[PDB]
């Protein structure tokens, strides 16, 4: 699709049986989801934004479905105010910014 | 143009006599520039992001040139880690996300 930017570009994603609303975010290097449980090993990471840093858990090789696209990558979990799909996954769905 | 997302989507903008690097950011409602001394009135404002909130100054109807497009709108100024072009100005240049 072509997604206009009049409103926040929110989409529903699926992660192992769970639906989540997430923001397609060209200003994010990484994908970050609000606190939730995920299987497998993880390691702590600090990520920064407007307003400073937060501690997140880093989970690698997680499969997610985003707008009908089945992708696999790193998912960070922690206190982001909104779920974020970052460039690590936007590149996998073939997303570009067009004007 | 069609901007891929393998690297951060940074562009040069021109605001008055100043040239700056800025991030084309679909995850930002508003445009926020690093501290600078713009003409005219301003209202203080709080904005939130990944690490919490920061305080900024809101200036309205400021002209900026972005990728050869002249836009005129609201610019926030404050301690942002990177200059950000948000959806308020992305829409004025006719930006969409495509995949």
């Amino acid at each position: 699709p072509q997604i206009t930017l009049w409103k926040r570009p929110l989409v529903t994603i699926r992660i192992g049986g769970q639906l989540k609303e997430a923001l397609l975010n060209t200003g994010a290097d990484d994908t970050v989801l609000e606190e939730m449980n995920l299987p497998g090993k993880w390691k702590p990471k600090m990520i920064g934004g407007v307003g400073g840093f937060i501690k997140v858990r880093q989970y690698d090789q997680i499969p997610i479905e985003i707008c009908g696209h089945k992708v696999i990558g790193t998912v960070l979990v922690g206190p982001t105010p909104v779920n974020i799909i970052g460039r690590n996954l936007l590149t996998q769905i073939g997303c570009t910014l067009n004007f | 143009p069609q901007i891929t997302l393998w690297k951060r989507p940074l562009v040069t903008i021109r605001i008055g006599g100043q040239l700056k690097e800025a991030l084309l950011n679909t995850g930002a409602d508003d445009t926020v520039l690093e501290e600078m001394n713009l003409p005219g009135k301003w209202k203080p404002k709080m904005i939130g992001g990944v690490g919490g909130f920061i305080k900024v100054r809101q200036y309205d109807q400021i002209p900026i040139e972005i990728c050869g497009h002249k836009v005129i709108g609201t610019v926030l100024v404050g301690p942002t880690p990177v200059n950000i072009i948000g959806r308020n100005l992305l829409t004025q240049i006719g930006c969409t996300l495509n995949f």
Binding site: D29, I47 | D30
Partner: peptide
């Protein structure tokens, strides 16, 4: 940084 989500 990271992750430049921003809102008002």
């Amino acid at each position: 940084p990271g992750n430049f989500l921003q809102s008002s």
